[PDB]
Amino acid sequence: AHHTDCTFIRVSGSELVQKFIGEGARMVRELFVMAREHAPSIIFMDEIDGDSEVQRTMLELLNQLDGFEATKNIKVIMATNRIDILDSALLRPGRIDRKIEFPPPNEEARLDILKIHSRKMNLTRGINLRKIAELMPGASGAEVKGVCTEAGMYALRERRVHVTQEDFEMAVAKVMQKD
Amino acid sequence: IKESVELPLTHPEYYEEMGIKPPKGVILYGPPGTGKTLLAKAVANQTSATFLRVVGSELIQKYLGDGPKLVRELFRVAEEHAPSIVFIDEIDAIGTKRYDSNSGGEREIQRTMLELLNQLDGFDSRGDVKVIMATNRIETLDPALIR
Amino acid sequence: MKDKIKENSEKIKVNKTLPYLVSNVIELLDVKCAVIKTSTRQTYFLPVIGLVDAEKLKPGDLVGVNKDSYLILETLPTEYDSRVKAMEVDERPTEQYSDIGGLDKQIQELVEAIVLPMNHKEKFENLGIQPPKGVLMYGPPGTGKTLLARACAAQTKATFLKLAGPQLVQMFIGDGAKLVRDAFALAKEKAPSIIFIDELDAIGTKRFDSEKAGDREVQRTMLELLNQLDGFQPNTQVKVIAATNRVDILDPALLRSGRLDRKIEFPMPNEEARARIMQIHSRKMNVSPDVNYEELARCTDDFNGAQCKAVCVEAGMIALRRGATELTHEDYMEGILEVQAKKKANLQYYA
Amino acid sequence: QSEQPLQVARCTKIINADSEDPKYIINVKQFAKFVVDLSDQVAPTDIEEGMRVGVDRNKYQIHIPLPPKIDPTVTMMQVEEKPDVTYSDVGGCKEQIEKLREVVETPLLHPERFVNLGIEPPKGVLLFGPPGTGKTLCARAVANRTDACFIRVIGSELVQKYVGEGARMVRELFEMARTKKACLIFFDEIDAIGGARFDDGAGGDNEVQRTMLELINQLDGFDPRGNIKVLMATNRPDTLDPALMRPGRLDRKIEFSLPD
Amino acid sequence: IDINDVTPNCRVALRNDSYTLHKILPNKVDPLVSLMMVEKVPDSTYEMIGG
Amino acid sequence: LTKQYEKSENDLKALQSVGQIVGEVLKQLTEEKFIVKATNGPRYVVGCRRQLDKSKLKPGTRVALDMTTLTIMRYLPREVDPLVYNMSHEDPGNVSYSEIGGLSEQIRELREVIELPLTNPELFQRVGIIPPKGCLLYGPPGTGKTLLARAVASQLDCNFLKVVSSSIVDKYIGESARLIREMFNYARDHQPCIIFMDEIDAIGGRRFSEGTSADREIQRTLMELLNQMDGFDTLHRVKMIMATNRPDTLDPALLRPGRLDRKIHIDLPNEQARLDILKIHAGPITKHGEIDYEAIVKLSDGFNGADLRNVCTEAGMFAIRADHDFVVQEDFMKAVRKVADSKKLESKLDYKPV
Amino acid sequence: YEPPVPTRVGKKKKKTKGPDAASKLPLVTPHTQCRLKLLKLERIKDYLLMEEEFIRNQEQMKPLEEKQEEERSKVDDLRGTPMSVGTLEEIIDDNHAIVSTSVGSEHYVSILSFVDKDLLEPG
Amino acid sequence: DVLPPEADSSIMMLTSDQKPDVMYADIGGMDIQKQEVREAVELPLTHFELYKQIGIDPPRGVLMYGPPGCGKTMLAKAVAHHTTAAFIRVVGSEFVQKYLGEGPRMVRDVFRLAKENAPAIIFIDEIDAIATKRFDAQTGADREVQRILLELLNQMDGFDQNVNVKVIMATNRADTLDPALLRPGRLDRKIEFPLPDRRQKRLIFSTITSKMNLSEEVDLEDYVARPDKISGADINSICQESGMLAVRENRYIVLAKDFEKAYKTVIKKDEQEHEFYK
Ligand SMILES: Nc1ncnc2c1ncn2[C@@H]1O[C@H](COP(=O)(O)OP(=O)(O)OP(=O)(O)O)[C@@H](O)[C@H]1O
Ligand SMILES: Nc1ncnc2c1ncn2[C@@H]1O[C@H](COP(=O)(O)OP(=O)(O)OP(=O)(O)O)[C@@H](O)[C@H]1O
Ligand SMILES: Nc1ncnc2c1ncn2[C@@H]1O[C@H](COP(=O)(O)OP(=O)(O)OP(=O)(O)O)[C@@H](O)[C@H]1O
Ligand SMILES: Nc1ncnc2c1ncn2[C@@H]1O[C@H](COP(=O)(O)OP(=O)(O)OP(=O)(O)O)[C@@H](O)[C@H]1O
Ligand SMILES: Nc1ncnc2c1ncn2[C@@H]1O[C@H](COP(=O)(O)OP(=O)(O)OP(=O)(O)O)[C@@H](O)[C@H]1O
């Protein structure tokens, strides 16, 4: 949405943001008025994981976008933890046009994530981020990002300015093993 | 579907000379992806009447009585824009899906169902409002609804 | 000085002109001085209270103040909700204890706990016992519960505050609690007084522990009623009548032996009572002197008083249906079938 | 210029009504509370406690008694255009129709034949049967022929968001019905709110049961109902509360069985 | 003030007594921008995505 | 009358006076400029009288302002809420502990929290503990929770705030939570003080996760109260007595030992406790013949204190029914049996805090 | 005192919505371009000429205060500005009703003649 | 005129006399919680430049959540007692006022007062009163609380990295909190205050009992080793109840028998578990 200049709308179903969507609030399709005004638009719902309200909102938005929506360039996205919990209505062919998998980062992908987030810290030269990536098997990007943030914490605990390799290793042990 | 939503409007003389009001309601049922919503899209393409589309899951509300209120308000707008075609797509989703946001449980859904019973065929006189319902699970509907 | 006093009183009248602005006294300070809160949601301090003695004012007292200078001009009567004031009966229904059949024991259990303490209060002081506090009348529908309440109001000169359970159930939090504590406050000021809460199960539903949702507002209204029946301030001058159909739904704290001392069970009318009930509701009716009410009572097994009354009402329909000016036994016999409401059947192959 | 605007206020208490200086305490909605006196053009006996009045903006003196406040939703529940269905459009329901008319139509049309014999006609009819049997069709025929006020109530319309509304709407429904010499209230699909009371641990249907309890109280309670003859239609009469299915609230149980 | 510039959901200034529309005030925060401000989804680009 | 003229003349002078707006000082800008806020209204930049002290106008001080100029006229003490005033000036009924039977152990625990710490603070300081500040009286209905509170309010020489949670609930926005603040502010300013909140489950119920707007406002009142029983500001010389027959529905935070340190169980009377209550209530009853109180106790199993009083009442009712001026053991025998039948309509009573 | 009695039957607005209003010209049949359609259209044209001449004559000798632009200009004066938006609560009489402002305060006001009385319903 | 920023604030800071007497040593067995609070509240206030040099973004707010009685409010008392910065204690329920607008008005007054007197700490106890995720648009209570919550989000959003104000929220029902409050930049540090562990129980027992005159015969390990899942308030109650039994017997020294009776009284744990399940 940032690169295609598409308006990014996050639909969490929160009643706090309901006054902005509309005073009616009876049906979730009332947000389409704000979506058409900001076309191209990307409507994003994340399922934190009764029945799922995010998946319910998917059906209402997808049904309108099928052939009953005049304005084009209104895309919709769902983020879910698992694909086998989805309703059969969403899993029906023709409803979701593409399903993209986000596997946990492997050794090389973790290094790329480690390289991205460690650029926001005062790093001593010669940090072997490859070893730190190897020390985090089966970790997510958020966990890798949190390891960097905790690595800077350990520098502060020793009142240091530059983050050393020991700090990253101590951060890996705390984030993964302890937590 | 044409004789219930298209022919009565384009050629009302056929019904009048025969002495019968057109078939009141219609429901499209079958396996998913069979073309139930597509036929309504074709119906909406070649209709001179106002087309109102509501998914059955939209009738499940967060507060007591708003479910019946929304059904009551949906058919009021249909009466204002007469003639009109009301497409209640995925009608079975009102009962086959349970959400915690719906304060009342199955009992509030039943009250919403009873409100829809009144709108389809009740005390109030109905104008030129044609109702189309779609469902892939017709066995889960209340038989009094599709009577 | 007599002319000066009269002339001063004339200037008093010009300032004391209507309309007054209703306010409530919040406080009485010394440096003789009063703080009032107007009905316009404004708090004012009065250096001098006004045309009312400071000793006669207490916090919360309703006063009428000047619309401009906000000084207290006079004291107003205690304020009760218009809904509470509208549930006090003034017509005094024309029922009688002789219009109730088969509830002699139930009537006696109610009169001796409600009317006897008010009239013959000496039988309790001499015996050293406390009069019963609250009477609950429970039973199947149509047993004559509300009817006895009308008879109690008919044959009692005390103030009677009719009331229904749903009337104490309101939108706003505490609104139902205010109504309950206003009804008992108004009943106290018109003592001796009787309060009849029909359909107690509307507010008396049992409390429960839940994590997601619950009817905490209605239980708050009931908890206020639990105070009024027996709370911190013992209110032994107001008699309470309670009627419900499902005593199993009621909260155990409501059915306590201090709030509802006597729990009178209203049974299905027996063979003797049913004949009496049909005779009662056929008084204003031209009934032929051949009706066997004993036979009709034998034909009305599992009938409450309402169905027995409906038999007489329905029998009049049949006499009008066939044009007869007098009700016969056959009209009563066939009117039982309509009240029985048996479903249509072709059970002619039996026997 | 001649007709000045009047603020709607509710009288609360009459002070010194016996004397020649009766002071009236009024509740001016959300504005304020005032102790006022009556205008010179209104009789002292025409204003009673708890009734709505019209007051001026200068001295707030009561100028005109007003009708009691009634929910606009409840007002719209009364029928103003009679349906196009007559009793000739109902077939196979002969005996059912006579029983329905002789309770809800005959007493209003020809009341003289009931007072003379000391007859109190039934004031309630329950129409029950499977869907499509003609329960609402016969009710629509009743409204077309009736000349008294006909109010149509749907049980789903009595289900409301807040606590005590359904009972409140029933109270204003009968309050508005009592302002007429003869009235008819039709409760289509009473089973929406007429379900039998139960205790399921949690607050299962507690609010809706209170709505039914209020309706039961108005039909047969301490106060007389009035000249209202109610008409209930449901396809699930087995779910109705026993106290609602009792004579004095639903005196006649007309069954719309499948036609022969 | 031109009537064509009076757009729905615009902020305007009205006189004290007549309430006459006499000035079009700067537009308020867009409801979507207000909605997305509380959601506060972190802004991202392709450079901060690895693997 | 000369005195009549003085009173009549006093009214004429009193009529010329004008009411003053009550506000609250927020901050003193200059020596002659103040920021004050109306009690229910806007905040203003106002002046002050020269003759006023201007040192007693600390921020938060209640002040009276001129209606026209809004100039500060005087500083007033902290306002006492009329509801809070009615709480303090509520008559308990002159109840003595001798009118309570079978609760001697329970009375001691109650008097160990609210009596000894307020009379002998140094006794607990020497050990090294802070005495408990809150106690909960829970039990089946009719066991004597309210009677005990009335007795301790009638006998203890201390400031007592008597209120029920259902009488504090107000429909206005934040009014109910405001009442709790004024309740404890009165207690803080009138130390030593005791707050009795009968039927605490009216506002002290478990916080709903999916409740209504009405529920949320009640919970805000609860956690306002929770912030005063045990919050940032320590409560000193203020004791709370809370009574409920359904402690299972109370919030875990309210039942926490930091707020309700003691959970005194006013249980149903036992064989000896039932006997004691009977003599309390059957005492003033006129009777001839031997009264076998033990026989009543055996048939009184499961009764509460109110039931045993009903036995005494119904026993006299049988005497009045038979036109007697006295009650015999037979009349008691029917009364205890008649009440026993009435106990079959009562649902589960055994509810305990979790 | 006696309660005012409305002359209008019912409390609801007129069912018809969005009509041709004064332009409800008759359905001249047939649509075919023949003589009687010309004859039928001429009769519509004739009465309009009669209508046009009559209306012009009345307004010509009507007082300067009573003019089509003057009365409409006057109507704004009776309405004034601003025009507060309220809610209709109850129709007491033909020219009297209870309305509530946005602040929740009800007023017993008088319904002026120029208001479309057929559009008035509670709520 | 333009009034001074520190003026026009219904909420005041904590004066010297209003500082709580609770010390860090008064709190026992919350080293993890103390470190997280210290690293997120009091260390950024004094070492903001060290954070920027390393590259850490200091957390604007801290949410302290856990079961009741686990040292949430008390740690805030210890922070206020041991801080060189201004402390603004407030309750969530205090923001809800009858006067519409006064609620959101005093939300920004707290943040304006904190911004003017930086460094400052804003402690909002019982945050659920104004941070509930459910709102009803037809009720004045939820409409006003929604305005209060929206202002609270706006006030925290309007604080850049330069302004040295730390916000602390405490709650025991964090499951009911609106997720918008926990977004990055508003409350980026969620510190959990769980029930004390066995090691945490002994430190809690030792600290409270250190202020009491005990006898050498009492062994705190007898009650520490108990498998009861009790909070710090429960342990305080056990010690508090032990001291009253000594007081009742006119004793100024707590014996072992008092602790045994106090522990049984305070815990009063119904079994609630049947042996046939294991
Ligand atoms: N018989 C058909 N002929 C042509 N296209 C069809 C046919 N059936 C389905 N399709 C295509 O399938 C697409 C998706 O199916 P559609 O939305 O109509 O499903 P449906 O039958 O309404 O089922 P459901 O709502 O249960 O998933 C339509 O847009 C249409 O292009
Ligand atoms: N025992 C009786 N004797 C005479 N009339 C009776 C008796 N029982 C019932 N009735 C008649 O039944 C009708 C309704 O009775 P009532 O309203 O008192 O019922 P209820 O038991 O209070 O009902 P519910 O509990 O369902 O409200 C009255 O007309 C009354 O005369
Ligand atoms: N006895 C009858 N004679 C003629 N037509 C009938 C009869 N019964 C039903 N109908 C027709 O069937 C339709 C069914 O609608 P109706 O309102 O009668 O149903 P109902 O009994 O109220 O059903 P539901 O229980 O679903 O509300 C009527 O509109 C009418 O056209
Ligand atoms: N121990 C007791 N000794 C003497 N009388 C008692 C005792 N317990 C209860 N009673 C009597 O019971 C009646 C009601 O008791 P009380 O008002 O104290 O109820 P409670 O325990 O607070 O019940 P609830 O749970 O309903 O509030 C009073 O008349 C009182 O005299
Ligand atoms: N680690 C600890 N050491 C000593 N005392 C403790 C400890 N943790 C909690 N306490 C005790 O907890 C009591 C107060 O609890 P506190 O207010 O800190 O908890 P909380 O989590 O904020 O409470 P709530 O969630 O109910 O608002 C004090 O009496 C204190 O002695």
Ligand SMILES: [Mg+2]
């Ligand atoms: Mg489809």
Ligand SMILES: [Mg+2]
């Ligand atoms: Mg009754």
Ligand SMILES: [Mg+2]
């Ligand atoms: Mg029907």
Ligand SMILES: [Mg+2]
């Ligand atoms: Mg009590």
Ligand SMILES: [Mg+2]
């Ligand atoms: Mg705390």
